[PDB]
Design a binder for this molecule. Structure first.
Ligand code: A5B
Length: 263
């Protein structure tokens, strides 16, 4: 099932974006009132668009994890149709970190990566391949919890066997996670900067990998490199990534850089 919500229990308060299917709002939901994100289906939709739009909520409704965006419910009996999710105060991860450049501890950044990895582990253990994992598709709440969203072709986030041979697996999601680690540790820099998609694919085949971010711990960058192994069977699983990041968090000197020992 999917909880069906009566439109009188929703208040749209502010437009916060333009989605694939229509406008997206911040609002409130009566259940004590809770802040929500509200995706609407624009009037004048094709049957395919209506099916696609409501399919997102079908997938999302199958999952319940602290690092996966919560579906509160849908409005499908009234118009416009709406998908109601938990509101995430700090928005998209890549934009959040760019606005906060240099303002987090390395422990805090690794903790965000730990949450993302835990959400992805849950997805993989439910045999869900995401295929579109990127910092723009992760949301951050006011307590800095990061949650995967976007349940429904960007070359530089995709594993080469998925580009060349359309082999999308949890292992290719792991490649994407590596790129996400690099987005996080650079505070939202664009992967491969403005190299062309062709130059990106060419460099990866020749063995180029993204370079170490400034002040990135050695174990974190080497974990990225392991996620970017050309042969997908040599990549860590998400269960391994979660276990590795927990060890680093528990030995936090492993995360320190020079400024932690000087000005
Ligand atoms: C977009 O900007 C924000 C969104 C915020 N919150 C928020 N919370 C939930 C959602 C969204 N946005 C949002 C806003 C606009 C758009 Cl177009 C989409 C969404 C999404 C969303 C996403 F960010 C990525 C992928 C899929 C999404 O919907 C499923 N999911 C729901 C908060 C702050 C900001 C900000 O920049 O200050």
């Amino acid at each position: 099932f999917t909880t069906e919500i009566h439109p009188s229990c929703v208040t749209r308060q502010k437009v916060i974006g333009a989605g694939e299917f229509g406008e997206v709002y911040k609002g409130m939901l009566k259940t004590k009132e809770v802040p929500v994100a509200i995706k609407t289906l624009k009037a004048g939709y094709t049957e395919k668009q209506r099916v696609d739009f409501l399919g997102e909520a079908g997938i999302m409704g199958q999952f319940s994890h602290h690092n996966i965006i919560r579906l509160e419910g849908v409005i499908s009996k009234y118009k416009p149709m709406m998908i109601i999710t938990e509101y995430m105060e700090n928005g998209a991860l890549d934009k959040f970190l760019r606005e906060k450049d240099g303002e987090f501890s390395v422990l805090q950044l690794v903790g965000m990566l730990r949450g993302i990895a835990a959400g992805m582990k849950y997805l993989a253990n439910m045999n869900y391949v995401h295929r579109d994992l990127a910092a723009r598709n992760i949301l951050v709440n006011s307590n800095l919890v990061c949650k995967v969203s976007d349940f429904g072709i960007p070359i530089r986030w995709t594993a080469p066997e998925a580009i060349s041979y359309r082999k999308f697996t949890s292992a290719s999601d792991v490649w994407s996670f590596g790129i996400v680690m690099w987005e996080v540790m650079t505070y939202g820099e664009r992967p491969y900067w403005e190299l062309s998609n062709h130059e990106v694919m060419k460099a990866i085949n020749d063995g180029f990998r993204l370079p170490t971010p400034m002040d990135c711990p050695s174990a974190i960058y080497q974990l990225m490199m392991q996620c970017w192994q050309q042969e997908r069977a040599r990549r860590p699983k998400f269960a391994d990534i979660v276990s590795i990041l927990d060890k680093l968090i528990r030995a936090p000197d492993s995360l320190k850089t020079l400024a932690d020992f000087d000005p």
